[PDB]
Amino acid sequence: GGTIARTIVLQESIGKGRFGEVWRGKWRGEEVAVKIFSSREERSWFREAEIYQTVMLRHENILGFIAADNKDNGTWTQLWLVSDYHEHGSLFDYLNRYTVTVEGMIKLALSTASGLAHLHMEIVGTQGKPAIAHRDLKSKNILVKKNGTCCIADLGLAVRHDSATDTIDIAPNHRVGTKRYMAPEVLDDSINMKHFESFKRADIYAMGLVFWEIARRCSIGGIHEDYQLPYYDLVPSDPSVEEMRKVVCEQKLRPNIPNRWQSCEALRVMAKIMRECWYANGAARLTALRIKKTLSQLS
Numbered sequence: 699g700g701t702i703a704r705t706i707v708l709q710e711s712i713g714k715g716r717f718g719e720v721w722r723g724k725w726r727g728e729e730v731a732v733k734i735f736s737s738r739e740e741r742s743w744f745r746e747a748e749i750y751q752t753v754m755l756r757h758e759n760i761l762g763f764i765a766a767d768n769k770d771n772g773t774w775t776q777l778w779l780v781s782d783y784h785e786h787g788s789l790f791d792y793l794n795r796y797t798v799t800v801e802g803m804i805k806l807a808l809s810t811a812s813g814l815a816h817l818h819m820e821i822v823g824t825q826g827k828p829a830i831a832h833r834d835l836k837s838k839n840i841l842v843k844k845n846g847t848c849c850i851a852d853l854g855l856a857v858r859h860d861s862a863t864d865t866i867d868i869a870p871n872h873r874v875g876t877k878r879y880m881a882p883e884v885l886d887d888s889i890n891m892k893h894f895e896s897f898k899r900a901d902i903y904a905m906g907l908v909f910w911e912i913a914r915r916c917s918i919g920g921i922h923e924d925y926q927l928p929y930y931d932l933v934p935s936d937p938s939v940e941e942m943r944k945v946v947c948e949q950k951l952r953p954n955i956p957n958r959w960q961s962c963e964a965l966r967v968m969a970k971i972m973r974e975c976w977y978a979n980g981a982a983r984l985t986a987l988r989i990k991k992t993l994s995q996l997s
């Protein structure tokens with residue numbers, strides 16, 4: 699019989715995501731995480747399985763993928779994505795629960811940037827990995843390991859670049875990601891979707907907003923800021939594209955960078971990075987590689 703879903707016992711409901719219900723389960727004694735999709739969600743299940751099975755994807759800062767599989771309970775069929783299980787949940791959950799040291803902030807920002815750098819990087823060869831842009835990077839799509847480093851997950855909305863023919867592996871649909879985290883050029887539809895670099899640039903804007911989320915919780919001498927999502931001060935919960943666009947593109951606002959942060963060297967390097975991810979012109983933004991180097995030198 700099958701060697702995956704067949705032998706997995708589900709233990710705890712984690713919650714309903716955009717696509718896929720998440721569960722914590724047990725696989726030959728080991729804790730695993732399982733995304734369950736229904737048969738009418740086959741497209742999203744397949745696409746996410748496809749991305750995670752990209753040659754040479756595995757990296758310690760991308761979620762460790764185990765298998766896609768089917769499970770027939772006798773009444774209906776379930777479509778399964780199985781992965782490593784991370785007890786701390788998302789970077790969102792961790793930043794709400796906890797404050798971090800300077801050491802902790804740098805681990806979270808570095809590991810995240812290393813994950814994105816791996817995604818973005820083309821590796822030549824037959825086993826060579828295609829460049830990949832996430833398209834929905836946000837604190838809820840990044841998980842926190844026990845060792846205090848991040849890994850990027852929820853790769854269902856990702857696009858892959860064929861550098862041989864300069865084509866993207868899907869016919870992309872405008873504005874698929876989380877509205878709050880969409881880059882300006884996404885919010886106003888000026889993004890050139892027939893340029894793969896444009897997708898990598900949108901990811902960098904989103905990562906800047908995530909770094910901001912982290913930096914707020916770095917507690918030095920007792921001083922830290924409460925957890926907020928980006929633009930908590932400017933837009934409602936569940937903001938519309940129009941609400942986001944009026945703030946990010948018309949009023950040209952970005953999350954606030956507190957005075958406190960220029961006191962410390964680490965927060966000053968982080969603050970400089972945020973601003974250099976938040977340019978309205980994607981071309982001027984830092985690359986994930988360049989950000990990885992900087993946080994490596996800082997650490």
Ligand SMILES: Cc1ccc(Oc2ccnc(Nc3ccc(S(N)(=O)=O)cc3)c2)c(C)n1
Pocket residue numbers: 712713720731732733761779780781782783784785786787788791841851852
């Ligand atoms: C392919 C796949 C399978 C499962 C999965 O879900 C996971 C994977 C790894 N770790 C977790 N852990 C986790 C634990 C708690 C919570 S929370 N926020 O509901 O407490 C969220 C995620 C979930 C994801 C994102 N992708």
